[PDB]
Amino acid sequence: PQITLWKRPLVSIKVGGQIKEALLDTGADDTVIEEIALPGRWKPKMIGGIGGFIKVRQYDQIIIEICGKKAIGTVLVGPTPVNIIGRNMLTQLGCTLNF
């Protein structure tokens, strides 16, 4: 798709056999989703840094789908006010900024 930016770029995503809402965020390095059971071995990761860090669980090589397009990459699972699709997944989707 071509997504304009007059509203927050919230999308429905498929992940872990569930459906979640998430924000397409070019300002975020990583993808962070709250409250999802994922397969494989995880390891703790500290993210943030500005003001403090939050501990999350890092799962690698997870498949997500957005607007019919699949992407494989790392998903961090932990508390987040909004679920975030960061650049690690946007690159796998072939997503660009255009103006």
- The conformation of residue 92, written as its DSSP 8-state character, comes to H
- Minimal distance, residue 31 CB to a copy of itself, in Å: 12
What gap in Å lies between CA 2 and CA 24, rounded to an integer?
Answer: 12
Neighbours of 29 (CB within 10 A): 10
Q: Of residues 25, 29, 30, 60, which has the active-site annotation? A: 25
Give the count of residues interacting with a copy of itself (CB under 8 A): 32
Q: Are 84 and 23 in contact (CB under 8 A)?
A: yes
* Contact flag: residue 26 with a copy of itself (CB under 8 A): yes
Q: Which residues bind a copy of itself (CB under 8 A)?
A: 1-6, 8-9, 23-29, 50-51, 66-67, 69, 81, 84, 87, 90-91, 93-99
